[PDB]
Amino acid sequence: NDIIINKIATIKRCIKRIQQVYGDGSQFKQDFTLQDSVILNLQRCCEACIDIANHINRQQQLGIPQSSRDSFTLLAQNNLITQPLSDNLKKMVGLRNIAVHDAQELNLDIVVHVVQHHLEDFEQFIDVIKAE
Amino acid sequence: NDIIINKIATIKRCIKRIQQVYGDGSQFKQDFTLQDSVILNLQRCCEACIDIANHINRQQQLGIPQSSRDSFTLLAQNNLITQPLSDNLKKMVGLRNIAVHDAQELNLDIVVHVVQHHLEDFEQFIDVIKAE
Amino acid sequence: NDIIINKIATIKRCIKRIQQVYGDGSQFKQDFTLQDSVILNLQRCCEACIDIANHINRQQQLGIPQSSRDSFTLLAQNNLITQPLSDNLKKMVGLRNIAVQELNLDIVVHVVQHHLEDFEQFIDVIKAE
Amino acid sequence: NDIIINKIATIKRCIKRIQQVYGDGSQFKQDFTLQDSVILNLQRCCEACIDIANHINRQQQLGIPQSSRDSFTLLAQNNLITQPLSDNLKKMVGLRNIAVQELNLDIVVHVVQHHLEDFEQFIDVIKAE
Amino acid sequence: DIIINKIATIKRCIKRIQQVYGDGSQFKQDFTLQDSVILNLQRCCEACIDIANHINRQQQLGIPQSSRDSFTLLAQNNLITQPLSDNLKKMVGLRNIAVHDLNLDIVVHVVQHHLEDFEQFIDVIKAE
Amino acid sequence: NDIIINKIATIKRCIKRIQQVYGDGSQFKQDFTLQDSVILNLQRCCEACIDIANHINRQQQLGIPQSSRDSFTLLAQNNLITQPLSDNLKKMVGLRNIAVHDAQELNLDIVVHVVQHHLEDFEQFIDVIK
Amino acid sequence: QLNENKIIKLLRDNIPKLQLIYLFGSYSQGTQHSDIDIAVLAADTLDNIARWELAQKLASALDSDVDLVDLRSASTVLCQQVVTQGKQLWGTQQDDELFAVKTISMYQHLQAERQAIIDDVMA
Amino acid sequence: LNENKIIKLLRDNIPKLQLIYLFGSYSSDIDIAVLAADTLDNIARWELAQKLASALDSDVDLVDLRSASTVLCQQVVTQGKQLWGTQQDDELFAVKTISMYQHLQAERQAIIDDVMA
């Protein structure tokens, strides 16, 4: 569907922007502007994923998502994403929430860990959805 | 009261960071990283204002917001902010709505216009609450 | 559920506006504008309750009410409200035809003084779901 | 007949109090008790018109009205009110709902400024009798 | 002109009640004098209603649903005090009982203590 | 019917009342007390007459009159009253209105022309209802 | 159909020294689409709040809105309507006829008093 | 409900119409939501409601989704029956609505919790 094609494109665009902005990491913990760019592009990835989840749930009538988190749990209980990936996406939403709404309690090492090891959670989500 | 001060402080920190990153405006439109920082700090200002507004709504029991923009309408209907300022903040919520739910159909000329002429709407909204 | 949350809010807002406008009485029976406000806010309370009742009747599949009073009769027969509260809510349905006069203004003062707690008791039962 | 004479009296009384309470649009803006007064007296006007219509439909044996709106169509189909005034009276039927309120307040103001005459027109057509 | 002639009738009818009900030695015993007082009380009662109906009429205060409503309409617009409204409606009820069907300790009581209400009503009305 | 028999006794009681108070009539036209009496007892007869008219108009389902005239008119229009007696009593309640509500334009001649020749009118209505 | 037996019973069980019950609304003429209009006469006037309460009691029992009129305190205009269009459901014929002529007489007197007022507002 | 009457009446009166939803009890009032390229004049929308009211012999509530609250947009997306418009526009409107609603629930949950004891 056309909507999922554009959300997957947005996720693609944002991942590289994260990559391209985080470069080697030598300046990320230092510069507020590279933290802002990385954090804002993680949010967009999260929202594009949430919108895919909300779109599938509505149009195949698996339920009404109360929140962004349950939108991924309903996809998991109908076995269209693996449980492990559901919880990773659910925990990425929560890190963004701390990252955008309360950055002075944000552990940037978590963001660096997510940047280095967890961006394929998004890409694993895209490979599942796309392999419908 | 504890939560309001922190939000107020967050708005000031975010305002300053927008100004420092937007500097003179020259390279803003040609570098996606500055855009990201400014856009993400604008969202922070809007969300912090909504949190201040909803917290007042809750402590004085003025109603249940039907949309994000309505949090400011309830402050205006009880005469705690002037409605010219209510509509400015509501317009800012709609731009957050655009920047969040639709990454790329932001028109950055609106974004720079907000930076140049409408950031004091945040400080007026913040200029009214404190004294209450 | 948004429908029940907003109807409970509408009931609370009207109950407060009734109390604020009626005050100690005093000037109430001599200003037709304060009588109109109280009377119209009482109707708002009754309709919001009827809407809550019909929404519960439908989502809990208790039956189809044929009338405004049947909305409360279905809740009482399934023991989600007591019969005394059911009969009090039905009484207020009668208030709709009191807008459309001083023979009635003591009916309104009677309702203001003795039956607004029936609205607050109904929403307390609904909040406890 | 006393039924129509008293309904015409209430419509006149309600139109007066709407005009008296609304004024020049003064502070009707942010004071919920005068909007409530205006809204409820517009309701009273609508109900009185429906009752006049039903009394004529039944006195003149034009049919049994199936709805509040069908009450005015029966008069319109027998040419005792013209079609535009019938449709104007029908769109007043819708008013009793938005009692149950701020961008709907422009609706109320719209009716106060442009549709009061519709009630007036209806009672002078009935005063033919 | 209607109100001034009605007030004239009330004044000459009251004076006629007073003259014929003298000391009241026989009011209770002879009926022709009961007849005169009762009809002139009725005339006083009727004339107040016409004054009231003429005022309601000239100021569009409402449509009386009953004779008592004539005085209720003046009181609800602050043209008579409600104590005076309730007294005049008390006389309307006695006119009703006289006309349609009267224990006469009631008429002796009104004659001796309640004519002032007729005279207060005309003193108000003319004052406006 | 008890309502009929009670009115009819009222009519007969008030006619005799009229006749006794105005025995000779020497001092009738300058003592207006005996005429407060005769005017009062005159409209009790009229009042009473109107009540059977009203009572019969309702029981026989001929309509509910809104004026005392229409009451006598409906009984004539259904042929239970002779029609000039309908006018003879319609004219009597009309004499009574002027008698009680406008007591200075009261000819006072018709007063005595009616206790004269038209007081029987009450009592043909009275036997016509029996 | 309207259940006139439960109307009678309910009013008898609740109104002391009841004398007349009338059905007189649209339901008395042809039960059109509506209040059920009911008039009662008792030896005393009823407390107005108590009368509204019994109206809602009948309303619950008949599953429709009910207007209960106490003829001892009702207007002449509304008494005339009850005798004109009303259907007696209880009480003696004597009490009904007494009420009728008292009402009808009072109404023709009120029409004389108020005619000029009526004429002006409908012309 | 004659849905065709609803469809026609709103097509003939609303410029650049994009979606029509029947929602509420019928999928009191027939509840109908429309989305056009512009927001509609509030008074014009009420008057168009009464025209539908006359033609359907019933009360009608006409909701303009471009100016309606998030709460009520969510209700139209959850319970509404589409009567007109493309499948793409419906899915676009749903994704925007549903997302905004989950954001609004985060902002206001403390308020709803306090009002529901």
Residue numbers in the entry:
A (entry chain B), B (entry chain C): 2 to 133
C (entry chain I), D (entry chain D): 2 to 101, 105 to 133
E (entry chain H): 3 to 103, 107 to 133
F (entry chain G): 2 to 131
G (entry chain F): 3 to 35, 38 to 127
H (entry chain A): 4 to 30, 38 to 127
The authors write:
Our subsequent work demonstrated that the HEPN protein with a RX4–6H motif is the toxin which cleaves mRNA in vitro in the HEPN/MNT (SO_3166/SO_3165) TA pair in the model psychrotrophic bacterium Shewanella oneidensis. Furthermore, antitoxin SO_3165 binds to toxin SO_3166 at a rare 2:6 ratio to form a hetero-octamer, and this binding is important for the antitoxin to block the toxicity of the toxin. Specifically, structural and biochemical studies of the HepT/MntA TA pair (SO_3166/SO_3165) in S. oneidensis show that the GSX10DXD motif of antitoxin MntA is responsible for transferring three AMPs to HepT and that Y104 in RX4HXY in HepT is the site that receives three AMPs from MntA. We found here that MntA antitoxin acts as an adenylyltransferase and catalyzes the transfer of three AMP moieties onto toxin HepT to block its toxicity, representing a new type of interaction between the toxin and the antitoxin.
The results clearly show that substitution of the Y104 residue of HepT prevents adenylylation by MntA. We determined the crystal structures of HepT/MntA and HepTY104A/MntA at 3.08 and 2.6 Å, respectively. Similarly, a (HepT)6-(MntA)2 hetero-octamer was found in the ASU of HepTY104A/MntA. In contrast, this additional electron density map was no longer present in the HepTY104A/MntA complex. Comparison of the polyadenylylated HepT and unmodified HepTY104A revealed that they were nearly identical with an RMSD of 0.396 Å over the 953 Cα main chain, except for the loop containing Y104, which was rotated clockwise nearly 180°. The MntA molecule in HepT/MntA was almost identical to its counterpart in HepTY104A/MntA, with a maximal root mean square deviation (RMSD) of 0.26 Å over 98 Cα and 0.29396 Cα, respectively. Although substitution of Y104 in the RX4HXY motif did not affect the toxicity of HepT, this substitution clearly reduced the ability of MntA to neutralize HepT.
